[PDB]
């Protein structure tokens, strides 16, 4: 059964039919500051929440390639949700991929870790940055993406990557005024296009306010 992890924003959660889905990949498009990395940091904490509070009751794994992982942000989100800051940090496993080979190798370690402890989320920010001969890189990336799908299938974790299989949800983020941001989703038998506004704060992703 699927678990939907809260993004911290009621509007964004509604757009996502509940939140970030375990068992599949959510691919977010946008540059740093559009909210993609902020969403990742928020999810690394909310995935630890009790299921009734919108969490996945599991640990988070964060593979960074940009050098933008910030433990202090996790502490702020933890305080916001009334969670132990120390426990939250101990429950987020982090690694920085040095190159594309390392990026893929980390998935083997990830799989071993998921056998030992319960994880609810795997973040890869960014899944493509290190890839930017050409055909060789494209095949390697394709393999990497299929491996992520296998992990989601095998362990039932939500896989969120920043930058497709039928189960992949693609989110296109853009800047709004000030701290507000907009997320847009496409081709949906329910609606051709749908959008939701959210905000990035010191303590994570929240709803946009006037």
């Amino acid at each position: 059964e699927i678990i939907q992890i809260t993004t911290g924003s009621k509007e964004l959660d509604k757009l996502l039919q509940g939140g970030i889905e375990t068992g599949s990949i959510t691919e977010m498009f946008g540059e740093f500051r559009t909210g993609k990395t902020q969403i990742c940091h928020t999810l690394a904490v909310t995935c630890q929440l009790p299921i009734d509070r919108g969490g996945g009751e599991g640990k988070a794994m964060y593979i960074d390639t940009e050098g933008t992982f910030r433990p202090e942000r996790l502490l702020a989100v933890a305080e916001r949700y009334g969670l132990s800051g120390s426990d939250v940090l101990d429950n987020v496993a982090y690694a920085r991929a040095f190159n594309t080979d390392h990026q893929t190798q980390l998935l083997y370690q990830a799989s071993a870790m998921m056998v030992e402890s319960r994880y609810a989320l795997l973040i890869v920010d960014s899944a493509t940055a290190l890839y930017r001969e050409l055909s060789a890189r494209q095949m390697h990336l394709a393999r990497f993406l299929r491996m992520l799908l296998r992990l989601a299938d095998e362990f039932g974790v939500a896989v969120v990557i920043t930058n497709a299989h039928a189960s992949t949800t693609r989110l296109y983020l853009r800047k709004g005024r000030g701290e507000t941001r907009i997320c847009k989703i496409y081709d949906s038998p329910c609606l051709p296009e749908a959008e939701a506004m959210f905000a990035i704060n010191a303590d994570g992703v929240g709803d946009a306010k006037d």
Binding site: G176, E179, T180, A208, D210
Partner: peptide
């Protein structure tokens, strides 16, 4: 907030 900054919402218009």
């Amino acid at each position: 907030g900054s919402m218009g």
